[PDB]
Amino acid sequence: FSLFYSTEEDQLLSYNDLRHFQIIWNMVDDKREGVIPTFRVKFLLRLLRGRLEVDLDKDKLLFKHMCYEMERLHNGGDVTFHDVLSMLSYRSVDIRKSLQLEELLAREQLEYTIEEEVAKQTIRMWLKK
Amino acid sequence: NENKGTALLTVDQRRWEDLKSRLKIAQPLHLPPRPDNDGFRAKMYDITQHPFFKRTIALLVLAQSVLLSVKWDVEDPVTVPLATMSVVFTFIFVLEVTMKIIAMSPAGFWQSRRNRYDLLVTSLGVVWVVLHFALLNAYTYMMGA
């Protein structure tokens, strides 16, 4: 019952969010391949609505971080419909209060490295010109 | 709880693990896109996806289930109205299933397990209907029940 029963929570991914994410994916994905390139992922992120709404001026940096995370997760390889889902689940909760010790450390290191890479690439782009 | 390694964890950790396990089995929805300029099928697709239509189907199924309030017997002088009402409900369900199939997809409809179960139920219903039209026995009433 704990495993399966779901209710609208505050700091957790809910069933309504799951259904809305599936709807967005379906309106994004064409033939249910489950693998999409970076452009499809970023357009899906732009099209996310509801509780997972990402205002541009509010979380532009977060959106860029998520897009680069999707890029780096497979060295530019296409996601498997769960990498996006796993990323959304991770970014929609409190990592410190939820994950286990080793998993929390690994996730924090990975997110910090991704943020540093994004900042370095942004600086390189802004300084090359 | 201790043997499965969750007693030492916090409640939030357990919730996160349960969410991860749940998302592991989540799968994309099975709705093909609605075609444009094909009003005959696009309108049907809109009809089948209307929440009021789903509530109507649920209410009809509930009424058909209620139709089994009394025991079905051949000696029963009032089983004929129940059989007729069940036949009408089965006809409605079969026509609705056919409408959903033609609107959604001849094969994509099969993607949903719920739709497969509904198709099986409607097939059993039409088989029972024709058997009632032919056999008309207590075994037929039991099959319909």
| B9 neighbourhood in chain A, CB within 8 Å | 100
The answer to whether A72 and A117 have CB atoms below 8 angstroms apart is: yes
A2 to B28: CB separation less than 8 angstroms, yes or no: no
Residue A13 touches partner B, C-beta closer than 8 Å: yes
- Quick count: other Cβ atoms within 10 Å of Cβ A69? 22
- Quick count: other Cβ atoms within 10 Å of Cβ B5? 9
d(CA B35, CA B77): 51
Cα A79-A83-A85 angle, rounded to 5 deg = 125
Give the Å distances, CA to CA, from A56 to A39, A40, B35, B80. Answer: 17, 18, 32, 65
* Closest to A40 measured CA to CA, from A25, A53, A54: A25
d(CA B30, CA B63): 28
B79 torsion bin: left (phi>0), alpha (psi -120 to 50), beta (else): alpha
DSSP one-letter code for A79: P
What are the start-end ranges of the H helices in A1-129? 15-28, 38-47, 56-73, 83-91, 95-98, 101-128
Residue A8 touches partner B, C-beta closer than 8 Å: no
Q: Backbone phi, then psi, for B63, in 5-degree steps?
A: -65, -45
d(CA B45, CA B100): 7
d(CA A63, CA A38): 13
d(CA A99, CA B10): 10
> Can you give the three-state secondary structure of chain B, one letter per residue?
CCCCCCCCCCHHHHHHHHHHHHHHCCCCCCCCCCCCCCHHHHHHHHHHCCHHHHHHHHHHHHHHHHCCCCCCCCCCCCHHHHHHHHHHHHHHHHHHHHHHHHHHCCCHHHHCHHHHHHHHHHHHHHHHHHHHHHCCCHHHHHHHC
d(CA B101, CA B95): 10
d(CA B145, CA B129): 12
| B28 neighbourhood in chain A, CB within 8 Å | 22, 25-26, 29, 32, 34, 81
Q: For an interface test with B, which of A1, A3, A79 has the most B Cβ atoms less than 10 Å from its Cβ? A: A3
Tokens of A52: 């997972």
Q: Provide the experimental method for this PDB entry.
A: cryo-EM
What is the Cα B64 distance to its own chain's centre?
Answer: 12
The alpha-carbon radius of gyration of chain B (Å, integer) is 22
The answer to whether B74 and B132 have CB atoms below 8 angstroms apart is: no
Cα A22-A28-A32 angle, rounded to 5 deg = 70
Cβ neighbors of A58 (< 8 A, separation 6 or more) are none
| List of long-range contacts for B67-72, beta carbons under 8 Å, 24+ apart | B68/B145, B72/B138, B72/B141, B72/B142, B72/B144, B72/B145
